[PDB]
Ligand binder design. Sequence first.
Ligand SMILES: [Cl-]
Ligand SMILES: [Cl-]
Ligand SMILES: [Cl-]
Length: 182
Amino acid sequence: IRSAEALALSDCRLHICLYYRDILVKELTTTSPEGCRISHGHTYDVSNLDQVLFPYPDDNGQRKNIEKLLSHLERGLVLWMAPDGLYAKRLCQSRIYWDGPLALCSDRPNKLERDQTCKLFDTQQFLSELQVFAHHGRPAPRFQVTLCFGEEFPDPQRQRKLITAHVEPLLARQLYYFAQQN
Ligand SMILES: [Cl-]
Ligand SMILES: [Cl-]
Ligand SMILES: [Cl-]
């Protein structure tokens, strides 16, 4: 019905944040409709997906372990927004834990199967959550995906998980922002 809502619903862009031990080390908005791949090291092939590369870690302290983890993130993780919603495909050797709107607490821990497409966010469910928000004012609809690479919990020797990501479809962010203006 509203043409601004149609635009948001049409948008395939993802907002992505990468953390090394709970420190922001990278933040971007994807531009490609085909999706994006998060990985370690340049790949010299043809691909219509955005290449999000893990940045070089800081020299101090946990560098050796992060590097080992990065070596299991070479092939990386493919993410893309369909009209349907947000999809994920793990291609890497490193295990990938996720939390998000399609996840349960009973289902936890939530792991991405290698080479298997998993759906992390669904637009119809989101629109339903968005309706509940519009009527009652709570709760905020859920649309953030959380990813940890390699670790289900922070190591005994370390306070934080080594590498974490945050993914938001801009579609949800903008629709929620709209709903807040009223
Ligand atoms: Cl590309
Ligand atoms: Cl790579
Ligand atoms: Cl890998």
